[PDB]
Amino acid sequence: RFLKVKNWETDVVLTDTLHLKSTLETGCTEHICMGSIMLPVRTKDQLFPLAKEFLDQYYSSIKRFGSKAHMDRLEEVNKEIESTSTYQLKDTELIYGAKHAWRNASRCVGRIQWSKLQVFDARDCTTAHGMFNYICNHVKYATNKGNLRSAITIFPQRTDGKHDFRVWNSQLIRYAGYKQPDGSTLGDPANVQFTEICIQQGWKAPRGRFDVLPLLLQANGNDPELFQIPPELVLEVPIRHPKFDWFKDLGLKWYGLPAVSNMLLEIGGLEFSACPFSGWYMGTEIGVRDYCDNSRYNILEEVAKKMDLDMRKTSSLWKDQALVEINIAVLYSFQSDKVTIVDHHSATESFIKHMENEYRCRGGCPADWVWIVPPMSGSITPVFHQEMLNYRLTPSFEYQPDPWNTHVWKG
Amino acid sequence: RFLKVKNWETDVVLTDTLHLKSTLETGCTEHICMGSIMLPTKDQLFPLAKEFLDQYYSSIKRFGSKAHMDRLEEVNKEIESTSTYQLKDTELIYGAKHAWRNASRCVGRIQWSKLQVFDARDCTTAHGMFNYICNHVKYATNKGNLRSAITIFPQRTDGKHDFRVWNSQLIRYAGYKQPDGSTLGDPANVQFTEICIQQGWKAPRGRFDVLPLLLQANGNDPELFQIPPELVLEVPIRHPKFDWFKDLGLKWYGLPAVSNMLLEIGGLEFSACPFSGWYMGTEIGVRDYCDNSRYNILEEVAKKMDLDMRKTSSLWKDQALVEINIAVLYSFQSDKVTIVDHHSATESFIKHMENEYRCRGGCPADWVWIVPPMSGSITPVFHQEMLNYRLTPSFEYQPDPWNTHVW
Ligand code: HEM
Numbered sequence: 001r002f003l004k005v006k007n008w009e010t011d012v013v014l015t016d017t018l019h020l021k022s023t024l025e026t027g028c029t030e031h032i033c034m035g036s037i038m039l040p041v042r043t044k045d046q047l048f049p050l051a052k053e054f055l056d057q058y059y060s061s062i063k064r065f066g067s068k069a070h071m072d073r074l075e076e077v078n079k080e081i082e083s084t085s086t087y088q089l090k091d092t093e094l095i096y097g098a099k100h101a102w103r104n105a106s107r108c109v110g111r112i113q114w115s116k117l118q119v120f121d122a123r124d125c126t127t128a129h130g131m132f133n134y135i136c137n138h139v140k141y142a143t144n145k146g147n148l149r150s151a152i153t154i155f156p157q158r159t160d161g162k163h164d165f166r167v168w169n170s171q172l173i174r175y176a177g178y179k180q181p182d183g184s185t186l187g188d189p190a191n192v193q194f195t196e197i198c199i200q201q202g203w204k205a206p207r208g209r210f211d212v213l214p215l216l217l218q219a220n221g222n223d224p225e226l227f228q229i230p231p232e233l234v235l236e237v238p239i240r241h242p243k244f245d246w247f248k249d250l251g252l253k254w255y256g257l258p259a260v261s262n263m264l265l266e267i268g269g270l271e272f273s274a275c276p277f278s279g280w281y282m283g284t285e286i287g288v289r290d291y292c293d294n295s296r297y298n299i300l301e302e303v304a305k306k307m308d309l310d311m312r313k314t315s316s317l318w319k320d321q322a323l324v325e326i327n328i329a330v331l332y333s334f335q336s337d338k339v340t341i342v343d344h345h346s347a348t349e350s351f352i353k354h355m356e357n358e359y360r361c362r363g364g365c366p367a368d369w370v371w372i373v374p375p376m377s378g379s380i381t382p383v384f385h386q387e388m389l390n391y392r393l394t395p396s397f398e399y400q401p402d403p404w405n406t407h408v409w410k411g
Numbered sequence: 412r413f414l415k416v417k418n419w420e421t422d423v424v425l426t427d428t429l430h431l432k433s434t435l436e437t438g439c440t441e442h443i444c445m446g447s448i449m450l451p452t453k454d455q456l457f458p459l460a461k462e463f464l465d466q467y468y469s470s471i472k473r474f475g476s477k478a479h480m481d482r483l484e485e486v487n488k489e490i491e492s493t494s495t496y497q498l499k500d501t502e503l504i505y506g507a508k509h510a511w512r513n514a515s516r517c518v519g520r521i522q523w524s525k526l527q528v529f530d531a532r533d534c535t536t537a538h539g540m541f542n543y544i545c546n547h548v549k550y551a552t553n554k555g556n557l558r559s560a561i562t563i564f565p566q567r568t569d570g571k572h573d574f575r576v577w578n579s580q581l582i583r584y585a586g587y588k589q590p591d592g593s594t595l596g597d598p599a600n601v602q603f604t605e606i607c608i609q610q611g612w613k614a615p616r617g618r619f620d621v622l623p624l625l626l627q628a629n630g631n632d633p634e635l636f637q638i639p640p641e642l643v644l645e646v647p648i649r650h651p652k653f654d655w656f657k658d659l660g661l662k663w664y665g666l667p668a669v670s671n672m673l674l675e676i677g678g679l680e681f682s683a684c685p686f687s688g689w690y691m692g693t694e695i696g697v698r699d700y701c702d703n704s705r706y707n708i709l710e711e712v713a714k715k716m717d718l719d720m721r722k723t724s725s726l727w728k729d730q731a732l733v734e735i736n737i738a739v740l741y742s743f744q745s746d747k748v749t750i751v752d753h754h755s756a757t758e759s760f761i762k763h764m765e766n767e768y769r770c771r772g773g774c775p776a777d778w779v780w781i782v783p784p785m786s787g788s789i790t791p792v793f794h795q796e797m798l799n800y801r802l803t804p805s806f807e808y809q810p811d812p813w814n815t816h817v818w
Pocket residue numbers: 098102105107108109110111113117150151152260277278279280281282285342347397
């Protein structure tokens with residue numbers, strides 16, 4: 001069964017066969033589309049199919065499908081699962097697995113880079129302090145003094161679900177949020193809850209607008225422990241505008257390294273509950289969302305005021321006009337400081353290229369339109385005009401519940 | 412089976428129960444989401460009639476009444492005897508208002524109940540259609556204080572006597588492929604323009620030529636008519652601060668009136684049912700003016716503003732996009748022709764969503780279409796989960812007639 005996607009700017013038609021390899025559900029039925037819904041212990045029995053399917057993919061990719069080495073590996077895993085109920089990935093399989101989770105991440109616009117990923121095998125890790133050292137090295141390697149490099153650190157897999165490694169931070173580097181007695185928020189409102197947890201655990205909050213949160217690290221199902229990332233390892237960029245000299249006086253800055261730390265990596269049925277990964281920002285992530293969401297730093301008003309726009313009526317498009325200048329500022333700042341960043345024209349154009357290549361070479365590219373289209377200027381980016389097919393391939397990055405909701409406290 | 416939608420900006424959660432009354436299929440499976448694809452007999456008719464009339468009689472709070480049973484019987488007798496049935500005026504108006512109500516791709520639905528329905532089921536010729544259409548245009552334009560309307564021509568019979576408006580909108584600009592190699596006018600209309608010329612239209616060959624209507628009655632060959640020029644309200648585009656903007660020579664029409672869709676009410680098919688509301692500014696400024704395959708004017712505007720077009724990262728496209736849109740709104744407001752900006756329209760739709768959740772148990776909405784093509788996340792709909800499903804009565808796409816019509 002062939003499926004066709006069309007681009008309404010170019011009339012290019014592509015044909016998807018890869019969707020035939022999807023197994024996981026989408027959330028949609030023949031009767032309902034949930035395309036815009038944000039979030040729509042395994043047995044021996046269920047594990048070996050998942051192992052076998054993964055190893056078959058791995059062996060095809062290395063052109064060793066059906067080989068003695070492929071067959072031995074299958075039997076070895078079968079027998080490992082039979083006697084221990086789980087199995088260990090070879091290093092080569094882990095790397096391949098992590099690259100594929102990224103390749104399959106349908107909400108990621110940066111996927112052209114999927115093949116260049118530094119994998120840090122942290123499976124020998126046993127303690128939170130151990131995790132801290134791994135994460136510091138990941139932060140330093142990936143930051144590379146502004147010349148950012150994609151990387152992922154993979155801590156030991158779930159066993160019985162009572163021994164999970166988890167990073168409680170949603171990103172390795174993020175700013176504290178503080179709810180005040182008067183209902184206002186200081187810092188990042190997205191991070192108030194986790195900030196509170198950090199404080200409760202013993203962190204001494206500076207209580208400013210850009211405090212880098214401590215890492216809250218859980219090893220082997222134990223209670224989590226706090227660590228300050230060395231500040232000299234935390235690369236930040238002060239935000240200024242090329243023509244507006246008052247912009248710097250807003251006091252904005254941002255960190256250079258986006259590193260998602262709250263997701264679950266699934267490879268061959270095995271579950272890697274701590275697997276922080278990082279790439280580099282697309283400018284709109286900061287300038288549109290983190291700065292201009294009403295539930296984030298919400299700076300549209302202050303900027304518009306400083307620009308002396310007509311704010312009496314929405315139809316003067318003041319919000320839209322402030323928005324462009326803020327994003328120009330973010331891109332200008334990062335580039336002036338030689339910290340990697342990609343604008344949304346460049347990133348979406350790169351993605352279209354990657355996506356076509358993927359159709360030719362792989363028979364598809366699952367893509368979530370709702371997520372891939374940038375949150376400003378949607379239709380002047382080629383992705384807006386691009387029909388996409390969204391479906392679930394393994395290996396994959398999954399969401400998982402926040403740990404404070406599930407963790408069994410040891411004391 | 413009962414479904415939650417969350418707003419991620421406000422944390423308000425609504426519970427959808429309306430999707431269980433869902434009839435048509437979506438394109439999506441449990442395996443694959445097609446949310447971003449643009450186009451994903453007597454025994455058939457009687458359930459469809461029953462379903463609609465049950466909902467109608469429920470709406471005037473007379474469900475299961477004698478008058479309800481009587482009508483079901485009447486319609487049933489009529490279908491068995493004539494293979495079809497006719498809607499009472501009341502059922503037609505309610506059907507039209509509700510097709511708009513169910514239009515999951517329309518952000519303007521807070522207005523759904525204020526709709527003028529012109530019953531044109533007594534029309535028999537293309538000339539009649541032309542008269543009805545002019546009258547719709549004039550009524551809806553209303554010297555710029557636009558008013559929503561639909562004109563409804565006779566329903567499909569044996570499918571060989573369809574009424575069709577061949578135009579995609581009542582009012583559109585022509586598109587011409589030139590010897591040069593470029594396109595003059597609106598590239599989206601190039602093919603339909605050729606059909607006008609081949610049918611006999613005398614094209615003025617300009618950038619903003621209003622197309623002639625190509626009207627088909629009773630399955631006959633379509634015929635050409637020019638809308639009286641004095642009935643087509645248009646707006647010259649100027650910017651409140653860039654005096655040079657006028658020199659681009661841009662204009663647009665005030666009346667957006669979609670003419671190529673099919674209205675389905677209670678299993679009956681109204682294949683000619685032009686309907687109109689009024690524009691959201693981004694439709695013209697972002698899509699019509701800046702789409703690469705439309706008038707594609709970003710480069711020229713950016714050139715006049717003296718932006719650095721050396722690199723994508725100066726956001727010169729984005730800067731010019733905002734200005735082009737400020738000019739559209741400003742020009743329409745200055746001429747007192749109804750227009751709505753994307754902030755105001757999306758805010759309205761959110762209020763409408765809440766109304767429909769609390770009074771109906773849901774509101775089908777297509778997020779891909781609802782979120783404006785500019786500044787998406789600074790409009791509240793961007794943050795609003797939406798469930799998309801298909802309810803009837805409905806507006807539906809249908810194949811262009813030049814592929815269907817046997818001359
Ligand atoms: C190298 C440059 C990269 C760029 C420019 C990029 C771009 C993006 C953007 C803009 C998002 C959406 C962020 C949001 O809206 O919150 C995203 C999401 C995502 N990316 Fe990337 N990405 C890059 C690298 C990576 C890497 C290295 C991985 C993993 C190895 C990855 C996997 C993912 C996943 C799983 C998501 C979904 C996150 C979520 O759903 O919250 N990306 N990407």
